[PDB]
């Protein structure tokens, strides 16, 4: 398991669509990624927290990937998260 605290760059308000791509991304990994953002911790492939994620600029979000491919999930997660603007 590894943590990734990300400093979001989006100020628009997260936008659920990018996060839905995160959903499908996390869905296809062995590892389960938890998204921890100030009270909101959720299975990242599950919208039960992610869809209402109130991240904006100062929001530092922490990802926890636990799996047989966790570090790999992390390295992919960072790429997609920066593509999706939930981190620099």
UniProtKB/Swiss-Prot annotation:
Residues 1-88 form the HPr domain. Phosphorylation on Ser-46 inhibits the phosphoryl transfer from enzyme I to HPr. It is found in: Cytoplasm. PROSITE patterns: PTS_HPR_DOM (PS51350), PTS_HPR_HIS (PS00369), PTS_HPR_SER (PS00589). Its main location: cytoplasm. The active site is at residue 15. Keywords: Cytoplasm, Phosphoprotein, Phosphotransferase system, Sugar transport, Transcription, Transcription regulation, Transport. One of its GO terms (cellular component) is cytoplasm. The modification Phosphoserine is found at residue 46. GO terms for biological process: phosphoenolpyruvate-dependent sugar phosphotransferase system. It comes from the Bacteria. Belongs to the HPr family. General (non sugar-specific) component of the phosphoenolpyruvate-dependent sugar phosphotransferase system (sugar PTS). This major carbohydrate active-transport system catalyzes the phosphorylation of incoming sugar substrates concomitantly with their translocation across the cell membrane. The phosphoryl group from phosphoenolpyruvate (PEP) is transferred to the phosphoryl carrier protein HPr by enzyme I. Phospho-HPr then transfers it to the PTS EIIA domain. P-Ser-HPr interacts with the catabolite control protein A (CcpA), forming a complex that binds to DNA at the catabolite response elements cre, operator sites preceding a large number of catabolite-regulated genes. Thus, P-Ser-HPr is a corepressor in carbon catabolite repression (CCR), a mechanism that allows bacteria to coordinate and optimize the utilization of available carbon sources. P-Ser-HPr also plays a role in inducer exclusion, in which it probably interacts with several non-PTS permeases and inhibits their transport activity. This is Phosphocarrier protein HPr.
